[PDB]
Amino acid sequence: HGHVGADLAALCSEAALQAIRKKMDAEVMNSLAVTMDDFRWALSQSNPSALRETVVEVPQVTWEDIGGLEDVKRELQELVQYPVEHPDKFLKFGMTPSKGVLFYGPPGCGKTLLAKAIANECQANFISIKGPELLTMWFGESEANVREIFDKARQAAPCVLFFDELDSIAKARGGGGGAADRVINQILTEMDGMSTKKNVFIIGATNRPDIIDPAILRPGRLDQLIYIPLPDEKSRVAILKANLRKSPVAKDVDLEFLAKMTNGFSGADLTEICQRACKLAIRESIESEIRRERERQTPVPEIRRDHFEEAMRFARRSVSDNDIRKYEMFAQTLQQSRGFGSFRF
Amino acid sequence: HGHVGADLAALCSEAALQAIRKKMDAEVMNSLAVTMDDFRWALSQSNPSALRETVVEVPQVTWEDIGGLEDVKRELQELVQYPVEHPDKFLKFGMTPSKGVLFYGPPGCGKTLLAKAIANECQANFISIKGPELLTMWFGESEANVREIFDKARQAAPCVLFFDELDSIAKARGGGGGAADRVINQILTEMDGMSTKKNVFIIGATNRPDIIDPAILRPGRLDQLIYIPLPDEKSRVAILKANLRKSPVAKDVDLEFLAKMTNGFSGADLTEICQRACKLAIRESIESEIRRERERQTPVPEIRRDHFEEAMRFARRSVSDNDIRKYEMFAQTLQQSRGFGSFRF
């Protein structure tokens, strides 16, 4: 990751040199065997240069690593795919496509993998601008480095500008102030600047939806807000299945049982459920190798279901019942139907 | 309830006269049938006088309604039963029996039914002083009617003097003050008064354990504090079985499944699950009678598990994750072992 073509040439070079210095003696030269251990060594000692150069790429999430969220899926489809995959209909009914959407909800509940998912379904380039980058632009006073981000999105159209943790600055000056940060204002400028053409969609997501600039939520700007709640039983069974994908997991485990026992568990909590179960399988496998090599020389093939019990004893529901209470207060603040239901005639 | 012998005579009198005014015509006189409907009418129309006179009585909880709480059960046995059922050993080792203990923890987690249970093993008269009584004594400035309560405990010995909601007053003057309430001080006086004999045990319980008078927690006074946590899986399956006792519940309902689904649920919420399941059975059975009588004339024998789904959809985990957090912060405020573990020699 972060490897340009010259970096890949350096990778192959150092791997071939590890094969050379592993053979280490002319016919033996032609029988050199560049094995995957050499590539892993070279990859562990490759110094890449292409990091900090943000990558545009159609990501691989395929909409079922993030299960559930059916109405959220429908809103994201009708906001991203329909403008770009059926654009004749929009110019027929005169609707300008919405310039962007604003996720909000509990931290680490599948908000980043929910814009990667829609970028994959739309087959659009995905540009994640994490909170540290906005913070860096707020501290170096380099509020003109976000013009470059939007220009990169414009060239990489169709795009998904996932402004991850849009409220990083508002947390960074939580308190003489009041609104309108240095670079959030620039995001507003070059967000109102581009037309509804070019199919660039900003999906800036906020953990805290109230501290943000209220000028963001104006129409034309990130007007649609989408609550991203905690995983439902389908959503968190898909989260457990995705986190345990590529992991050798036993057949006797019931991931639906886990997903049924975990109610208030955020998506990140369900990762640390599986990354403490993988960690316990690591401990048991390595300990088994140690007690084998010291005695019988002189296996834990899979994460057994008692590892999903020892790991699940350390199950920390990270998002409280009062954080999500405030997010639902914001949600009902955003719901003002109030009697225009059964508007008949 | 609240019926003295004269009130019971009035109850039988009005029930017999309801039988008389139901017959409503000399041999028919001797054939009067005082049926349970007459007694239920008499109860619905009986004015009792013995209310507000607090009843001393060995309660009926038998430690199986309050399941789990095994270490708390051991502490309560060691604090109540051992002073009274094995008093020779205490005078042998010179230990004075503790005058009082103080429960604390989340509201409605089985604290009242946890002093009734130990009063039931002790076969001691149980005297519950609810929070409104302490508040009433704090507002009328009649702080000398708690001498009467302790005197009634002295005559009704052995006792479990459950000063329920001991921090009612501290909540009622949240804030010029600081400690040492009007009648909390009198409870301290009459608690320091009686000797460790007479076997009167004060088990006053607080929802909020920090706002209480810190002079209460001095040794000699309610020095032992016992954390009453949210129900464990055994505890809440016993709670669900106890709340559903005397109610016709199905066989195919899985109460251990309910107790396994519900983690943060306090005991009161587990009652309201059953009192919304019984209420839904009421609705369905009454609607059955209604559309039978209006059509078939011109049954829901048990609470089916589809009522324990629709009722349990309205499941409110009433105690937050930040309330029990503060109770645990107070709990290891109360644990300062700190390196004197493994004190060997």
What are φ and ψ of residue A303, in 5° steps?
A: -75, 100
Can you tell me the distance from the alpha carbon of A235 to that of B237, in angstroms, rounded to the nearest whole number?
28
Q: Does B322 touch chain A (CB under 8 A)?
A: yes
Residues A333 and A327: beta-carbon distance below 8 Å: no
The approach used to solve this structure was cryo-EM
Residues A100 and A161: beta-carbon distance below 8 Å: yes
- Which amino acid makes up residue B250? A
Q: Which of B36, B311, B297 is nearest to B289 (CA)?
A: B297
User: What secondary structure letter does DSSP report for B294?
Assistant: I
Using alpha carbons, list the distances in angstroms from residue B30 to B34, B43, B153.
11, 24, 48
State which H helix or E strand residue B287 sits in: helix B267-291
Torsion of Cα atoms, B329 then B335 then B341 then B345, to 10°: 170
Torsion of Cα atoms, B34 then B40 then B41 then B43, to 10°: 110
CA closest to A319 among chain B residues: B321
* The dihedral sign for the CA sequence B97, B102, B103, B108: positive
Q: Which two tokens stand for residue A150?
A: 């939007």
- Which amino acid makes up residue A108? G
- Which residue bears the tokens 């990859």? A43
Q: Which of B69, B315, B324, B110 is nearest to A317 (CA)?
A: B324
**Could you tell me which residues come within 8 angstroms of residue A207 by beta carbon, excluding any fewer than 6 positions away?**
A104, A105, A106, A107, A165, A167
Residues after which a C–N gap over 2.5 Å breaks chain B:
25, 175, 298
Asked if omega into A158 is within 30° of 0 (cis), the reply is yes
Can you tell me the distance from the alpha carbon of B32 to that of A144, in angstroms, rounded to the nearest whole number?
99
Q: Does A333 touch chain B (CB under 8 A)?
A: no
Tally of CA atoms within 13 A in the half-sphere of A118 that contains its CB = 34
Q: List residues bridging with B221 in a β-sheet.
A: B219
- Which residue bears the tokens 């519900």? B262
Residues B267 and B239: beta-carbon distance below 8 Å: yes
Q: How far is A254 from chain B (nearest CA, A)?
A: 15
Using alpha carbons, list the distances in angstroms from residue A150 to A54, A168, A214, A309, B80.
12, 19, 21, 47, 73
Q: Which two tokens stand for residue A99?
A: 């310039």
Tally of CA atoms within 13 A in the half-sphere of A78 that contains its CB = 9
Q: Does A309 touch chain B (CB under 8 A)?
A: no
CA closest to B316 among chain A residues: A321
Can you tell me the distance from the alpha carbon of B36 to that of A39, in angstroms, rounded to the nearest whole number?
89
| Cα A218 from chain centre | 26
Chain A residues touching B312 at Cβ < 8 A: none
Q: Does B91 touch chain A (CB under 8 A)?
A: no
CB atoms A322 and B321 under 8 Å: yes
Can you tell me the distance from the alpha carbon of B102 to that of B204, in angstroms, rounded to the nearest whole number?
5
| Helix %, strand %, coil % of chain B (to 5) | 45, 10, 45
Sheet containing A125-128: give its strands across.
Answer: A125-128, A159-162, A200-202
**Testing the interface with B: which of A321, A325, A326, A328 to mutate, by most B Cβ within 10 A?**
A321
Chain A residues touching B320 at Cβ < 8 A: 320-322
User: What secondary structure letter does DSSP report for A107?
Assistant: T
Q: How far is B256 from chain A (nearest CA, A)?
A: 13
Q: Which of A9, A28, A8 is nearest to A19 (CA)?
A: A28
State which H helix or E strand residue B11 sits in: helix B5-23
The pairing of strands A125-128 and A159-162 is parallel
Q: Does A313 touch chain B (CB under 8 A)?
A: no
User: What secondary structure letter does DSSP report for A103?
Assistant: E
Q: Does B295 touch chain A (CB under 8 A)?
A: no
